[PDB]
Amino acid sequence: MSEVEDTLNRIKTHKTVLGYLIVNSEGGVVRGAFKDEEESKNIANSIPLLTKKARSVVRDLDPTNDLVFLRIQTKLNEIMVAPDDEFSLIVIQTKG
Amino acid sequence: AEIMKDHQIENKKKKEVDQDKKQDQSMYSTSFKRCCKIMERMVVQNDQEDKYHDYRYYWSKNEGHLLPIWRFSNEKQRKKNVTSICWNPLYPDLFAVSLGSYDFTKQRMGLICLYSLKNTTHPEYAFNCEAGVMCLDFHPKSAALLAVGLYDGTVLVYDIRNKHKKPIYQSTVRNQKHTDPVWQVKWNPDTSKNYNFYSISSDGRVMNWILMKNKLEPEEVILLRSTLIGLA
Amino acid sequence: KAVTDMDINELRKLMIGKAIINSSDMQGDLLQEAQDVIQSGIENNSAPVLNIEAACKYIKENLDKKFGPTWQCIIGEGYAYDVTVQNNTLLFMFYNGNLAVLIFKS
Amino acid sequence: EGVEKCIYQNNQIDLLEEYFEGETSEHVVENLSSKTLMLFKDEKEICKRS
Numbered sequence: 468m469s470e471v472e473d474t475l476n477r478i479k480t481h482k483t484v485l486g487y488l489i490v491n492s493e494g495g496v497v498r499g500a501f502k503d504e505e506e507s508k509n510i511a512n513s514i515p516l517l518t519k520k521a522r523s524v525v526r527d528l529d530p531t532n533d534l535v536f537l538r539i540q541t542k543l544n545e546i547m548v549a550p551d552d553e554f555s556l557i558v559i560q561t562k563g
Numbered sequence: 564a565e566i567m568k569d570h571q572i573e574n575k576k577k578k579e580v581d582q583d584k585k586q587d588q589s590m591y592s593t594s595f596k597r598c599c600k601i602m603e604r605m606v607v608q609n610d611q612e613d614k615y616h617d618y619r620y621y622w623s624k625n626e627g628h629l630l631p632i633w634r635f636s637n638e639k640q641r642k643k644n645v646t647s648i649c650w651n652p653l654y655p656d657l658f659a660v661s662l663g664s665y666d667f668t669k670q671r672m673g674l675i676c677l678y679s680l681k682n683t684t685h686p687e688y689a690f691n692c693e694a695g696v697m698c699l700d701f702h703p704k705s706a707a708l709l710a711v712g713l714y715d716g717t718v719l720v721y722d723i724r725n726k727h728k729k730p731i732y733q734s735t736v737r738n739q740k741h742t743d744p745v746w747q748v749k750w751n752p753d754t755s756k757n758y759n760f761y762s763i764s765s766d767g768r769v770m771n772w773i774l775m776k777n778k779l780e781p782e783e784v785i786l787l788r789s790t791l792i793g794l795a
Numbered sequence: 796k797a798v799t800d801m802d803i804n805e806l807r808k809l810m811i812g813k814a815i816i817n818s819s820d821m822q823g824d825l826l827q828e829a830q831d832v833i834q835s836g837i838e839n840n841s842a843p844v845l846n847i848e849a850a851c852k853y854i855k856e857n858l859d860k861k862f863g864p865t866w867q868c869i870i871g872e873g874y875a876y877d878v879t880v881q882n883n884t885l886l887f888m889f890y891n892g893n894l895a896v897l898i899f900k901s
Numbered sequence: 902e903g904v905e906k907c908i909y910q911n912n913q914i915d916l917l918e919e920y921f922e923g924e925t926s927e928h929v930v931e932n933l934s935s936k937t938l939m940l941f942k943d944e945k946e947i948c949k950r951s
């Protein structure tokens with residue numbers, strides 16, 4: 468298919484995006500498209516724990532209602548994560 | 564889990580066959596597609612936030628002011644003209660533009676683009692056709708039904724729901740297709756006699772098309788028609 | 796209807812006397828004894844509003860007389876623990892809704 | 902005033918809405934086929950028998 472593998476190529480090519488990284492449910496790197504490897508390795512380990520911890524937050528308040536999309540916003544950067552059961556998509560977009 | 568065991572009524576589907584294949588595109592397919600699509604839009608949203616904050620409530624005595632916000636285009640598709648545009652009657656965000664060729668002497672293929680206000684970068688749906696698409700329309704009741712008219716007066720019908728993206732229906736010479744082009748095409752709001760699709764050609768015959776199972780039934784409504792030659 | 800009609804606030808209200816076991820390091824026969832005592836114990840001293848101290852006063856004393864002298868039992872809505880225990884001395888069963896019961900013998 | 906700012910942005914568009922989510926093709930053209938399963942026939946008869 469062109470459709471997932473093209474959209475993922477499109478959001479990378481898109482201006483003011485550092486890189487898109489797919490995390491496996493077992494905290495593993497399927498695709499990692501950042502500049503420096505330290506950042507990509509760091510993002511691969513650190514962020515999927517925040518999303519699991521942030522999933523337990525929304526879950527406690529209402530255990531029917533599951534996480535569909537998490538967006539953190541830092542001083543310099545934004546961090547946006549779209550979690551699913553099979554895979555999790557992560558991006559880092561610099562604020563305009 | 565114990566409640567589902569207690570009450571086995573409508574057992575949970577989505578069986579774990581997945582995609583698999585080890586390497587070279589593993590899954591990357593249907594729950595994950597949603598997450599990819601949502602991510603794209605939300606990445607755009609952050610870069611266009613300045614324009615999106617304006618779009619909703621900028622709020623722009625006998626004076627008017629018009630503000631252009633976004634332009635949706637494609638560099639491959641700069642040759643073709645916009646011709647007809649239409650909005651989906653169900654969804655006020657999703658609109659469809661139908662790119663075709665004017666000026667007669669120059670004639671190329673036409674691609675129908677369904678741009679969502681959600682994602683302004685590229686279309687939500689593409690549809691390659693044989694000639695330039697002149698007229699496009701949406702059926703007021705079911706917005707999936709898409710009415711298409713293009714050169715050689717061929718009448719096309721599409722469903723947005725269908726994934727394959729080929730035409731659901733087509734008009735042929737055996738189904739009495741009008742010659743030359745089809746400038747305008749509209750849906751009949753009435754759904755008592757299946758689905759009535761209306762078309763006009765430059766040949767000058769107002770044609771009523773009815774949707775049937777693997778066939779299109781044409782009916783000549785009126786003829787346009789003086790010391791001249793042919794039909795008006 | 797069935798699972799779709801059932802919401803969390805309906806599921807909890809529909810059924811209070813349900814029972815669900817997560818872990819079970821203790822032997823098959825000794826669980827049957829304890830499970831009956833803790834369920835009957837909590838419901839007794841549930842009172843108008845659930846006294847979590849009162850529940851674990853009753854369970855502590857019962858499980859001291861029944862088995863061994865140094866038996867430790869804690870209940871709660873939600874918590875994290877690591878607890879060194881003897882072999883086949885530990886049961887973890889949560890009651891319906893928002894009640895997590897850890898019982899062990901130190 | 903910092904949260905009011907974030908409410909406004911999300912209220913502009915739903916952004917998670919899927920156009921024609923769930924509902925299938927519905928009416929789809931089905932061509933009328935006739936699959937010949939099996940032929941019967943007589944073997945080495947004097948002339949043919951209708």
